Design a protein around this ligand. Structure first.
Ligand SMILES: N[C@@H](CCC(=O)N[C@@H](CS)C(=O)NCC(=O)O)C(=O)O
Ligand SMILES: N[C@H](CCC(=O)N[C@@H](CS)C(=O)NCC(=O)O)C(=O)O
Length: 226
């Protein structure tokens, strides 16, 4: 016995596939991690406004910040898990990452590239520090002292949370778009960032909600060319 849920997300270039839409992917991830039954319909953007929107027991919801808080609240225990993070810093971290990428990827002045890359890099470093630094709840299993490097799987702990549902779609877009148009690789030295990405891309709830890389590339084909 579940509620009736259809999530409407943005379609990709063929009008049917999953398109590039990080807020759509965020809600898709939330619903999957809740364990609730739901259908996903893609909307060809070539009623409401832009996706995502959601129909929940026959009622249309279009304010998508409000969709997130409604799902988290509504779909509650005992039946479904709360997905909110233990620590707020799990949200706060990376809150500026996408904006720094957005400036960098649309910069058309080759001479400013180094400065824009440095600004993106400063945010990656901040995320990396959050991910390598043990959370307050972490106890090394061999020594019972606080680990010298965090080994938790995700932002907030060993389970995917709302924080991950928000950030991972943004990280995928950055990874794909920046590589294609600026030949940028997330530095290998950001060992926490990569621990997190390898763990996340190991999860079907993340990888199978990603659009094909080409969709993301198509998004930036006209803004990211210098
Ligand atoms: N800010 C520069 C010149 C290159 C540049 O455009 N940098 C950036 C990216 S961090 C910027 O905010 N541009 C200011 C502008 O709009 O001209 C420098 O350090 O010499
Ligand atoms: N409308 C579908 C998108 C739906 C979709 O791709 N859902 C997949 C992700 S690839 C899924 O794993 N859904 C399982 C679930 O609802 O739990 C399409 O043909 O592109």
């Amino acid at each position: 016995v579940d509620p009736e849920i259809e999530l409407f997300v943005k379609a990709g270039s063929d009008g049917e596939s999953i398109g590039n839409c990080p807020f759509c992917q965020r809600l898709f991830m939330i619903l999957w991690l809740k364990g609730v039954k739901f259908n996903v319909t893609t909307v060809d953007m070539t009623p409401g406004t832009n996706p995502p929107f959601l129909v929940y027991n026959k009622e249309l919801k279009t304010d998508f910040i409000k969709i997130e808080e409604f799902l988290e609240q509504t779909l509650a225990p005992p039946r479904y898990p709360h997905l909110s993070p233990k620590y707020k810093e799990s949200f706060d971290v990376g809150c500026n990452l996408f904006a720094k990428f957005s400036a960098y990827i649309k910069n058309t002045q080759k001479e400013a590239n180094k400065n824009f890359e440095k600004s993106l890099l400063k945010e990656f470093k901040r995320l990396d520090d959050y991910l390598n630094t043990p959370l307050l709840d972490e106890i090394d299993p061999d020594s019972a002292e606080e680990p010298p490097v965090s080994r938790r799987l995700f932002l907030d702990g060993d389970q995917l949370t709302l924080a991950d549902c928000s950030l991972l779609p943004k990280l995928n877009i950055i990874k794909v778009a920046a590589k294609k148009y600026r030949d940028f690789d997330i530095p290998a030295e950001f060992s926490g960032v990569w621990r997190y990405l390898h763990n996340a891309y190991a999860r079907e709830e993340f990888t199978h909600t990603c659009p094909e890389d080409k969709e993301i590339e198509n998004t930036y084909a006209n803004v990211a060319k210098q």
